[PDB]
Curated annotation (Swiss-Prot), chains A, B, C:
Changing residue 180 to K: In LCA11; does not alter the enzymatic affinity of the corresponding enzyme; alters the affinity and/or the specificity of single-stranded nucleic acid. It comes from Homo sapiens (Human). Residues 98-155, 161-217 form the CBS domain. The lineage of its organism: Eukaryota, Metazoa, Chordata, Craniata, Vertebrata. InterPro entries: Aldolase_TIM, CBS_dom, IMP_DH, IMP_DH/GMP_Rdtase_CS, IMP_DH_GMPRt. One of its GO terms (molecular function) is IMP dehydrogenase activity. This is Inosine-5'-monophosphate dehydrogenase 1. The active site is at 311 (thioimidate intermediate).
């Protein structure tokens, strides 16, 4: 076949469908290939898959799911800054380990107020001055509240709490694993971490979820990694603070055409106000474009212009690049400076994901391929997109594993035991390509139900 | 408008789409109308809706769901008798109240065996001679087993059980509400009901589910009502016993054409071997047909021939009846002997359900309208059906409430405050009808998403 | 429901799809219903089904098949009279019992001539003056000829015949059953029936075929009943003789509109030149039309005008009648004089056949429904038909039994144990009908594969 360099020296407009990969020597099982990949210069993920920040794709629910499956979710603009910050708060509060700021109450409150807290925040389990300085009086939970009816709005916590002397508690200074051990071998669900003066909390739901989700992408504090997209205008500097107060780990600068003085200024702003925050540059399709955002200190580069399944940018603008050529030509340069690429748009099926991953992309952000799932949101001003529709596609819980299995099988029967080794062979020529004619693409095709 | 008698005196082939109902005097809210209806002569349901016993509709999962929503599910033939009995067992074991036959173990077993029981039967909580005579040694549960790894298959229950002296227990003789009270005000999930000699169990999951499902159709023992369809041949008499050992409450005799000596013999067999079982006659579309099955002592009558969304019986047979005319003409006679009718086939939307309910049907069985949901099964020999397909329709949990809301709104704006009063007015003329021409049906029609 | 008289008193244009039959009391198995029916006043058939004489439906092969399945075949006009007579000869020679005119040879012939006879006539087994007066010299057959190669065209029958002294033979005067017994208990295939002077033949193939085809419609001489369609012009009187020399049993007078002086003249000609030949009148759709052909002495009446699946007669002519109304109104009168009716055109599926049989038709003739089968032929001048096409439909051997099964099931679940009792009930009101609206026909409908 043809090496990547020889394939892309043709100067043709090679998208993904314009070439294939010649298979290799299988030497391992379909479940042994490692999918480890980097979302950012200082964030590593188990699943290279990402969810694109669009109004009908990525909100708190999709971010929760995609962080549980080892990926990540980026939240969108079509909402108020307060709404975006609230969604990020939900994402980071889904699974938390140390519950350092419970929904605390004072013994003067009422079971009706406990029910109100259950509705508004979701938790029926809340410890009972009503601040993070109160020596425990007790705890309330579903098993203390549930049977009460017609009397909740008139019953003090006095009649239903658990007096602390009956509680099991732990000291302030024990590590998380030790607190988990004390919780596990206490046959109870909540272990308040208390100070020597008797003034955080760890739950069992977090451990059950750690069981249920082996690949969940968690931070150093056992909270789901979350990201957010911040614009380039002046107003964006209040949105950025309102959200970074929520602790977003990575931000993608949202812009159709990335290379500009404006995004460079926004970078120089972020990388000087919050030096520990990780940034992703704007959509570039050229090494000359990416040079500026790399010199600006950016840690990752979104790649793709006009190749979206919902994007008519080429039609309306006469600018862009073929998807696969852009991805290869940009990643071959970004790789020189440790900057992950993200192939955005153009991905219709798992073969496209595998092609993009082999072409240099350290991760892959997808849009419409993830839309219409049960977790997705919903049930002059020249335009650049179409208000399309997609058929129902089920839950991410069932869908993402299909993609992971497909990528692993592809790596198996292409001969790569890891997504790093795959790229190594590609950049060393041990992996081979061949172009496809329209008749060949016709040949390679055809009630289909993969699961 | 036209009374029901005057409408059906026309002798025309009036299906549901061939007439409408003139609205009346609204005097109440959309949520005040009562939907109480009888599935059988001695079974009353909260939701008149039923799920038809077909290979791609009704299995254990669908029956569980439809019993939770106040309806009922009938299990099909396309499987072994053992499979059908197992499915009925699952349905009756989903929510049980008194757990009279737990998955009991002996202290000589192993945590690996507890995990095996969790996988095969589903419960991780099981009490520990290992029979229903053992004085309790302890109990095991997720909070006793979960943290164990690489040692489960070599650890006796000695290291992990809860010694009984630490357990809370109750005496044998307390009523279910008292046992529930002791469980609720003990802050624990399992209360073994023990004899005075210290040799059943009630869980908290049943009470949580009773909270979550107010309208769940439960028997006198707090187990979901379940049904099964048994044929008419000689072999069916072993299937009938193998399933009635599971405690099916109601049986529908499955046959295209009901009136026959064969179904009469099967009736006379059931109603003399298991006199307490309730039977539903075969598909009849005529009062003369229904006379025989009524005199045979049957308690309910399935109605509908050739009107199924997947049925080509008229095309292949030249026999049947128009759906609405059959339903009215048969129910007007069955009503004379307290026998509920079931309108089967011909129902595409909620208006059809409302029409059938107004026409006399005490309940309504549906096929394709419920197919393709997340809960449904799957992902010469002259034929009478087609292997069709349906688009995804989501979960029953979300779908059935749409139907209940629609039927309630229909009753509201037709002026009926209950499904009994609706039928009373219909049979007394206070409810009025009018025929529709093809142009009128064209007029009354038209991206649609009801929820 | 509605009696036939009340249904057809509506004066509407009721085709088959415009009403249904209400079911009744099943009292027997699906294979117990008798399908005996009369093709003509003096021909009774086991299978009411007939094949219509059209260029693309009925030739020798189709007639052979449809006579084997208990029906009959009528041969067409689109060919020379010699061709039609030859086709009838093939039909009557397919299975023959007494082979009274074998392909006889003289011992001076050659094995090459035996092969030539095998190719031209089909039989490799022929007895060896070479006329029906020769005292047998021997017989030749595949087992005497097959191994010979490169020498067949130069070998006399002397080297290969079976000398008569080695043959088993029977006397002239034995009945067919006795000769068959002698053949069966002789362990050989051909038994020459010889005169006392030692000057017919029976094969084992005829007995094997009598085994394989229990319902085959055979004449009094064990030859397949065959028919032919003869025009009404002057030239047709030579075609009639050229074919009646072949022994056609029944003739259908082919004409779009039957009632005319020309067809009456043709009747009066046939019924006076060949008084033993049975005739079928021209297409009538009215009792006033049928009166003339009945008084002309006709023995059967083809019914149907403009209702063919390939006929545009109404469109081009403004004349005809609705199919079901015509069939009922004509058969109710013809029945008065023992004349079978034949419902032609309008039968799309088995339900149509059942409806027609219930309506009075003693038989039914089909066109396109039988076209495209493996047995069918092929692989100003105002027009009245269209050169349409049909999808492949398999062999008659498999397809006819499906129709028998369907008609029998229809009779079962409509409550008729015989096609005579069905008609008797219909004419006495024990069978009931109901009209269908367009919405009802829409309801009763829907990858379908009946076998
Ligand atoms: N990459 C793709 O495939 C693609 C294609 C089309 C659209 N999109 C997405 O749709 C959106 C379109 O981005 P956009 O750049 O058009 O929107 P934008 O909000 O960044 O800006 C819109 C217009 O204002 C300009 N602008 C940017 N920052 C400005 C500032 N601070 N002051 C003044 N003008 C400023 C832009 O150059 C552009 O002309 C983004 O979400 C983009 O990612 C993506
Ligand atoms: N009413 C409708 O809308 C409709 C239409 C078509 C099919 N169906 C369903 O499809 C199936 C078809 O039922 P069916 O009656 O054809 O199937 P079946 O298994 O009851 O019997 C098939 C055939 O055998 C006969 N039969 C019945 N019991 C028999 C016995 N004990 N011994 C011998 N023969 C016996 C029947 O009369 C029929 O001819 C059923 O599930 C029926 O409900 C329903
Ligand atoms: N039954 C149906 O639904 C239907 C409808 C249309 C056509 N067909 C078939 O197509 C063909 C059409 O028949 P057709 O009557 O048009 O053809 P035909 O050859 O019988 O006669 C054609 C014309 O000649 C006339 N004619 C017939 N015999 C005559 C005679 N002896 N002397 C003088 N004139 C004579 C007829 O009246 C007609 O005008 C037949 O095979 C008919 O059965 C059937
Ligand atoms: N309470 C609690 N403990 C956690 C959570 N996540 C990890 N831990 C604990 O932190 C330690 C990490 O163990 P791992 O097996 O590596 O856990 P993991 O979350 O699957 O993997 P990592 O994210 O790589 O740590 C153990 O003591 C875990 O019980 C969490 O969400 N809640
Ligand atoms: N109580 C509490 N839980 C929090 C908070 N923030 C995040 N969580 C997470 O809430 C998750 C579920 O804990 P709980 O709400 O107690 O769940 P539970 O044990 O099923 O309790 P109930 O909701 O009473 O049924 C855990 O993963 C916690 O990390 C917080 O402020 N308070
Ligand atoms: N443990 C347990 N108790 C139950 C169950 N169903 C009902 N009960 C108890 O039986 C009594 C019935 O109370 P209801 O409010 O009528 O319960 P429901 O199941 O919603 O309604 P019904 O089915 O009409 O009894 C109460 O004491 C319930 O707690 C069940 O599944 N499990
Ligand atoms: N233990 C037990 N439960 C049963 C049995 N049959 C039905 N159940 C039902 O199982 C349901 C769930 O109870 P549990 O198994 O305790 O569920 P849980 O409290 O979530 O406990 P885990 O399954 O250990 O997580 C209840 O509604 C019981 O009625 C049985 O034989 N044993
Ligand atoms: N020999 C012969 N058979 C005839 C004739 N007319 C009809 N048949 C039929 O031919 C059919 C087949 O008989 P055979 O020709 O002997 O068939 P076979 O036994 O397979 O013999 P081979 O053709 O030699 O293989 C029988 O059903 C006969 O009735 C005729 O003139 N001669
Ligand atoms: N050689 C020969 N004998 C036949 C044929 N048909 C019937 N026979 C004989 O004639 C007698 C009639 O027996 P049946 O059982 O009535 O035969 P069938 O053809 O199945 O039925 P029928 O047509 O009613 O005579 C028996 O002696 C048969 O062997 C035939 O095609 N060939
Ligand atoms: N540390 C503790 N020591 C003693 N009792 C406690 C402690 N924490 C909570 N409790 C009380 O005992 C129960 C401990 O179990 P847990 O906190 O998991 O309850 P829960 O949330 O109701 O369980 P579930 O949600 O699974 O029904 C609580 O319901 C509660 O009222
Ligand atoms: N009657 C009892 N008295 C004392 N301890 C009990 C009793 N029944 C069970 N236990 C032990 O204490 C716990 C009681 O809570 P429960 O039975 O609901 O646990 P669980 O099923 O693990 O809860 P969950 O499934 O909601 O996490 C069990 O985990 C168990 O091992
Ligand atoms: N009456 C007879 N007596 C003795 N031999 C006979 C007689 N008729 C035919 N034969 C010879 O013996 C064989 C008798 O069997 P039969 O006539 O069925 O042969 P066949 O047609 O070759 O059989 P098949 O076609 O099944 O292979 C013939 O092949 C033949 O040459
Ligand atoms: O509204 C729009 N107009 C044009 N391009 C868009 C729009 N919204 C998102 N995009 C881009 O198109 C991508 C979607 O690619 P997809 O995975 O093929 O759906 C996004 O990740 C953005 O880069
Ligand atoms: O396979 C089949 N052939 C013909 N009728 C069927 C078949 N299966 C089920 N039916 C009938 O058709 C009904 C389905 O009606 P639906 O609600 O309109 O789908 C069932 O309840 C049965 O009465
Ligand atoms: O060429 C034609 N033009 C008009 N009618 C025809 C023609 N050929 C046959 N017919 C009639 O149409 C019938 C076919 O009916 P079918 O079974 O519905 O195909 C035949 O039996 C004839 O009565």
């Amino acid at each position: 076949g043809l090496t990547a360099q020889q394939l892309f020296a043709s100067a043709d407009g090679l998208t993904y469908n314009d070439f294939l990969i010649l298979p290799g020597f299988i030497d391992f099982i379909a479940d042994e290939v490692d999918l480890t990949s980097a979302l950012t210069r200082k964030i590593t993920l188990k699943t290279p898959l990402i969810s694109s920040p669009m109004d009908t794709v990525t909100e708190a629910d999709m971010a929760i799911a995609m962080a549980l499956m080892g990926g990540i979710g980026f939240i969108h603009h079509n909402c108020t800054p307060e709404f975006q910050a609230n969604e990020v708060r939900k994402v980071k509060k889904f699974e938390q380990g140390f519950i350092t700021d419970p929904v605390v109450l004072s013994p003067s409150h009422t079971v009706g107020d406990v029910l109100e807290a259950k509705m508004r925040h979701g938790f029926s389990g809340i410890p009972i001055t009503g601040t993070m300085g109160s020596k425990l009086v007790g705890i309330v939970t579903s098993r203390d509240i549930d049977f009460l009816a017609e009397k909740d709005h008139t019953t003090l916590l006095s009649e239903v709490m658990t007096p602390r002397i009956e509680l099991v508690v732990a000291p302030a200074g024990v590590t998380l694993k030790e607190a988990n051990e004390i919780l596990q071998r206490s046959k109870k669900g909540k272990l308040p971490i208390v100070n020597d003066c008797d003034e955080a909390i760890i739950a069992r739901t977090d451990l059950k979820k750690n069981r249920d989700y082996p690949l969940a992408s968690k931070d150093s504090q056992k909270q789901l990694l979350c990201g957010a997209a911040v614009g380039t205008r002046e107003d964006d500097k209040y949105r950025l603070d309102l959200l970074t107060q929520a602790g977003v780990d990575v931000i993608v600068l949202d812009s159709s055409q990335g290379n500009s003085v404006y995004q460079i200024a926004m970078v120089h702003y972020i990388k000087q106000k919050y030096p520990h925050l990780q940034v992703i540059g704007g959509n570039v399709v050229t090494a000359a474009q990416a040079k500026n955002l790399i010199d600006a200190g950016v840690d990752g580069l979104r790649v793709g212009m006009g190749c979206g399944s919902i994007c008519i940018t080429q039609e309306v603008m006469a600018c862009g690049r073929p998807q696969g050529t852009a991805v290869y030509k940009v990643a071959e340069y970004a790789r020189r400076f440790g900057v992950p690429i993200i192939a955005d748009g153009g991905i219709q099926t798992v073969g496209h994901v595998v092609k993009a991953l082999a072409l240099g992309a350290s991760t892959v952000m997808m849009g419409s391929l993830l839309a219409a799932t049960t977790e997705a949101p919903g049930e002059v001003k020249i335009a650049q997109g179409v208000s399309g529709s997609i058929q129902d596609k089920g839950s991410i819980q069932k869908f993402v594993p299909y993609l992971i299995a497909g990528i692993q099988h592809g790596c198996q029967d292409i001969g790569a035991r890891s997504l790093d080794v795959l790229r190594s062979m590609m950049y060393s020529g041990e992996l081979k390509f061949e172009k496809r004619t329209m008749s060949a693409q016709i040949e390679g095709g055809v009630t289909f139900l993969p699961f």
